[PDB]
Amino acid sequence: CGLVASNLNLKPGECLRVRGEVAPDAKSFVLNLGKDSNNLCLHFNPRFNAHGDANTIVCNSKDGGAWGTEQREAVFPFQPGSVAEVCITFDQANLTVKLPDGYEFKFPNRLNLEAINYMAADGDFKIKCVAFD
Amino acid sequence: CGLVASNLNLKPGECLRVRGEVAPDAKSFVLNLGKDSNNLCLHFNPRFNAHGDANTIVCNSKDGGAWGTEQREAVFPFQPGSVAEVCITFDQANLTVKLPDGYEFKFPNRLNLEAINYMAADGDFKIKCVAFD
């Protein structure tokens, strides 16, 4: 798979910035955030052409190994063959994901974790820069 | 205790750039690089005042869980309570740790691994930004 980072200790309100290159023939990519691979407060999955979906942002949680209820966003500000940046923060109610074009969406915080300690990237996205504040 | 990153897939000649905050009361900090926590082609350990050393960089390898022989430097361009930036690369012969100001540290490549896949920070160093080039 792709980059895995742990012991991040990202607290509420602190920003996680991730910049990467979207493959020219990208089918999808994933950024997973949470405690570990079984406990994700955000599974962020832009699907260019994957699982039957096209140009769709899919979000979900995973709690104790179990996928939660999936949600989708209508907008898709990713282009294959381009560099994309995503900035993520959270509070007790929502994750807030800020997207390249300045789009911003929220995803409910279903896990109640004190911090984001784990990030994993997968798929057609080559990570170039990760920053914390 | 600090950030741990895996699946880095950093190949010879590629550049790992790291920026972090050296704690105000720093006694020492560590950046570990290699395949995993038991196989380190570079343990890079600036000691302000730790383990009997004062303002000395200690470098070592770890191979199958076994520490190699330490290498020490006289030059010491780190200060507590400051931001430190390093650029790391390797080839067949050496690991090279470069600082913006032009300091360059070399440590023999003892493990001969195809890539750096693992990086970990420990001690009085908070990673703020990691980049791959």
Ligand SMILES: CO[C@@H]1O[C@H](CO)[C@@H](O[C@@H]2O[C@H](CO)[C@H](O)[C@H](O)[C@H]2O)[C@H](O)[C@H]1NC(C)=O
């Ligand atoms: C039956 O609906 C589809 O189920 C798929 C299998 O669970 C699902 O794909 C998974 O989505 C999760 C996030 O919810 C994650 O991305 C896994 O990698 C996927 O395999 C599809 O998203 C579902 N399709 C719809 C339209 O809901």
Ligand SMILES: CO[C@@H]1O[C@H](CO)[C@@H](O[C@@H]2O[C@H](CO)[C@H](O)[C@H](O)[C@H]2O)[C@H](O)[C@H]1NC(C)=O
């Ligand atoms: C007895 O000499 C000192 O031994 C310490 C313990 O082995 C050693 O510290 C360890 O070094 C490794 C790297 O080789 C790593 O930094 C560990 O975290 C340390 O606990 C000191 O380097 C030795 N000091 C001297 C002056 O020889």
